Amino acid sequence: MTEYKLVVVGAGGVGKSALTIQLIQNHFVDEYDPTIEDSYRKQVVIDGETCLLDILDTAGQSAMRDQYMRTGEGFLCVFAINNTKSFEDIHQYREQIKRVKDSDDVPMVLVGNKCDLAARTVESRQAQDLARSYGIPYIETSAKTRQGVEDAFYTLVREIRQH
Ligand SMILES: Nc1nc2c(ncn2[C@@H]2O[C@H](COP(=O)(O)OP(=O)(O)O)[C@@H](O)[C@H]2O)c(=O)[nH]1
Ligand SMILES: CN(C)Cc1[nH]c2ccccc2c1[C@H]1NC(=O)c2ccc(O)cc21
Ligand code: NA
Structure with a gap:
């Protein structure tokens, strides 16, 4: 079966760990050690094909990051809307x-x-404009409610698969 190396990147506190654990273990972890960088594996069916996902949840403890950037096939670039x-x-x-x-x-x-939070400081339009200049998809998620979580990851798998 096809294997995919996904890397979750972004500033500390955006919810990289909460997104990864919500995809892998189906639960919201509000307290996860911000210094641990760990990998998770998951077998999933995406568009009728069994995939093996190897997901790196980065922690930011810059040249040391090059190793996972070299191994990584797709990157989930996460920011928080607040x-x-x-x-x-x-x-x-x-x-x-x-x-x-x-x-x-x-x-x-x-x-x-x-995206479950009120009073957002980053508008959807700003992120859509940023995503358009990179030629990549923009998706809003909530690791708390699980909204868009499967979509964000499976869209990244599709971006790799279609490259
Ligand atoms: N309301 C809300 N809080 C979230 C969400 N995702 C993460 N958090 C919280 O944001 C904080 C940082 O999350 P974490 O996964 O450790 O971020 P990381 O440093 O990027 O790994 C914690 O207090 C989480 O409970 C989300 O979608 N909604
Ligand atoms: C092989 N797997 C058991 C772990 C794993 N999953 C990944 C998914 C995407 C990208 C990299 C990886 C890695 C490791 N390979 C690296 O180069 C690297 C650098 C820093 C790390 O913390 C982990 C890894
Ligand atoms: Na983390």
């Missing part, structure tokens, strides 16, 4: 990925997490 800095940070993650991969066409999905 963290302007995490949205502005995306430009930096995108550039490092492009440089390490030596390519302008790397499978990526921009994810705006914590």
Whole structure:
């Protein structure tokens, strides 16, 4: 069966761990050690094919990150809709990925997490404009309610598969 190396990247506190654990274990973990960087495996059927997902939940403890950028086939670039800095940070993650991969066409999905929260500081339109300039999909998610979580990951698998 086909294996996919997915990397979850983004500023600390955006919900990278909560998104990964919600996909893998089907539950919301509100307290997960922000220093642990761990991998999770999951066998899933995507468009009638059995896939093996190897997902790296990055922790940010920059050249040491190159190793998972080299192994990684697709990147889930996560920001929180109530963290302007995490949205502005995306430009930096995108550039490092492009440089390490030596390519302008790397499978990526921009994810705006914590969509259950009120008073958002990053508008959907701003992230759509950012995603359009990169030529990648934008999806909003909530690791808390599980909204868009399967979609964000399976869309990234499709971006890799269709590359
Ligand atoms: N309301 C809400 N809180 C979330 C969501 N995802 C994560 N959180 C919270 O955001 C904080 C950081 O989450 P975490 O997964 O550790 O982020 P990471 O540093 O990017 O791994 C914790 O307090 C989580 O409970 C979400 O979709 N909605
Ligand atoms: C092989 N798997 C059991 C673990 C695993 N899953 C991944 C999914 C996407 C990208 C990389 C990986 C890795 C590791 N391979 C690396 O290069 C690397 C760098 C830092 C890490 O923390 C982990 C890894
Ligand atoms: Na984390």
